[PDB]
Amino acid sequence: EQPEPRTRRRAYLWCKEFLPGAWRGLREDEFHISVIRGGLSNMLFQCSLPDTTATLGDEPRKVLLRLYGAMVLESVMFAILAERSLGPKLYGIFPQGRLEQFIPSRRLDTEELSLPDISAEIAEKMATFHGMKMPFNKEPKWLFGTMEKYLKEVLRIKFTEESRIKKLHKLLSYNLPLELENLRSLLESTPSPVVFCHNDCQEGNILLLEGRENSEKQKLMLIDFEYSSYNYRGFDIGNHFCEWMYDYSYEKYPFFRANIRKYPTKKQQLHFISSYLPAFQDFENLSTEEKSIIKEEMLLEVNRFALASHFLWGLWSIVQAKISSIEFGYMDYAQARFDAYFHQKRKL
Amino acid sequence: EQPEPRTRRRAYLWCKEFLPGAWRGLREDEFHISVIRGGLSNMLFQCSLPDTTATLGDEPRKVLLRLYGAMVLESVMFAILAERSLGPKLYGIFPQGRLEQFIPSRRLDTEELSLPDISAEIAEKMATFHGMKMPFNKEPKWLFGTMEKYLKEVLRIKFTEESRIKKLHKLLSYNLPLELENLRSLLESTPSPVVFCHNDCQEGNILLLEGRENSEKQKLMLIDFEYSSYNYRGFDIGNHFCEWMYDYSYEKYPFFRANIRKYPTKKQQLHFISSYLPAFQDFENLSTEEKSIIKEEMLLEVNRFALASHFLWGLWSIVQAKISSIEFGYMDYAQARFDAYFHQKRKL
Ligand SMILES: c1ccc(C[n+]2ccc(N3CCCC3)cc2)cc1
Ligand SMILES: c1ccc(C[n+]2ccc(N3CCCC3)cc2)cc1
């Protein structure tokens, strides 16, 4: 798929001006670009030298253009992860977007999250992410700060369309401000270390790296850290466990499938935190008693913070139903997160 | 010097929230802060743990707070230089400023720039800076782009003070638009490689590192990359040579000294580019003949680009005389840069 002419022009000039070697002397007529993801927001394009053009130096042959269609924090963070080889390289930054390394890969599918070696490697990559120093606010205000902002916005919302009006009345009927305070009191009493969290560790943000599919422990990269913050570790892991239940590749309305039965079993959760803990702290030398206590208390921690994954994404999704024009059943998704919230409360 | 109460409060909270280990549990009453530089713009403060407080990990004991009083590019650049150990570590970033490693040091004095070992190390540090890949526009539009912006602003300016009105009329009498085109024709005929330039390599932006004063080749750090861009190498070197003539530490009006005789001699220029060239490009393995040809070519290049240092800082200084409330003789400095411009033209 070719982009619109204005985009091809701007993309050609960004590549020509920001990228070194063969890019600097490239003509408009030699520029290869194709759409990876369309939309009004966060469009992706592959940009490439001709197969016949030789590289002068170490410049890449293809790059990813990301157009926007908080910017400071996200840009600094992307640049830092690039310097530490924990993200794609940053080739160019300008007001309208970035040029990034193109990483030959695909996203994981929902069903791949439960494969033991995939799950063990996500746990190791998340533990690594959790351990790094970032120049951002270390006070864990992100979680309840964000839920309070969305709740405020949710209580102001008026839909005009019938089906959206009825769905919102059902969600509002739960008394979301009271439920939020009950959730705060539970998590206030749930110790969880503050770490640098991805905050959106789903299959769509996990690369299966082409040519590494036979590697047991090094075939993945976590990407798209735009929601990242210092946050309770319990949130990041609980949120990941929730994502086992949601498949965003469903091609008919509401453009997701939810399956409560797909949440990881205690066995699958122990397999994940058993990879996470050695990678985060050594831990393997502790007594079996201490290891068991730590794991059991961590299962409780992540399953409780899983409630905040449901609550935050539920509220987020109601706001998107108002402000987003993306083809997605936001209100149905909100209801699915709240069904899972009350089911998880009953399970606990 | 102690800051204002409001500032002490905000500084305490930034350090407490952004810095790890002992900072996280620090009380207001344990907070040590003192002013390094006042002003309406770019205030600096030292912030410190008590001498009695032990560090829990590898957190710093003291840090520099920088308050502002372009932001994306400058923040990403600072973060990248920190990651590569070419600038101070970045401990925190927020809308009002940054935290930053405290580097025990002082600035060089103008007179130190001509010390052979100081000059050789500035040349090596600038060569290193010139060699690095940065995610910025590589098209060298910065130099004439900036001079055209300042010239446009200079031609709009009306002063209300009589002495400033007369000083501007003399500067305007040179026919700055014609002189800019004479400069364009000279520099368009002068090859100079495009490199990542500091653009402001003066003594005030060169740290003498405390405890390294006996190191021959590693006692300096270049700082304050706020004006950095891809630019003609000739500008960065020519600009540095011009800064041998200007002392900004003079305590009486106009708060600088200018001395045309302090420009580096051919010998001192060859000493600098003799350190620069091996550190930038390999060059070491060329014959004596090839080295001499390249050096003589480079003396031409850098002395011509020196004219653009005079012209750009001259125009900049007229604009600052309008908009800046810093106590400095901006119009006298402008006249000094234009005197040096016409003197350098006559010399060439
Ligand atoms: C642009 C943005 C989003 C989509 C579709 N989509 C995919 C995943 C979505 N979610 C993942 C996080 C919870 C909701 C929401 C919407 C398609 C294009
Ligand atoms: C702090 C801030 C400003 C000043 C004085 N000053 C110093 C240097 C200036 N220049 C920057 C390099 C060329 C002109 C301009 C003004 C002195 C101390």
UniProtKB/Swiss-Prot annotation, chains A, B:
Subcellular location per the Swiss-Prot or TrEMBL entry: Cytoplasm, Cytosol
Signal peptide per UniProt: none
Disulfide bonds listed in the record: none
Binding sites annotated in the UniProt record for phosphocholine: G39, L40, S41
Enzyme class, first EC level, given as a word: transferase
Record keywords, A-Z: Acetylation, ATP-binding, Cytoplasm, Disease variant, Epilepsy, Intellectual disability, Kinase, Lipid biosynthesis, Lipid droplet, Lipid metabolism, Nucleotide-binding, Phospholipid biosynthesis, Phospholipid metabolism, Phosphoprotein, Transferase, Tyrosine-protein kinase
Entry's EC annotation: 2.7.1.32, 2.7.1.82
Phenotypic consequence of K141Q: Mimics acetylation; promoting monomerization, leading to decreased choline kinase activity. Increased lipolysis of lipid droplets
Keyword Transferase in record: yes
Single GO molecular function: ATP binding
Taxonomy, superkingdom: Eukaryota
This protein's pathway: Phospholipid metabolism; phosphatidylcholine biosynthesis; phosphocholine from choline: step 1/1; Phospholipid metabolism; phosphatidylethanolamine biosynthesis; phosphatidylethanolamine from ethanolamine: step 1/3
Subunit comment: Homodimer. Heterodimer with CHKB.
Protein name (Swiss-Prot/TrEMBL): Choline kinase alpha
Organism of provenance: Homo sapiens (Human)
Parent sequence residues shown: 81 to 455 of 457
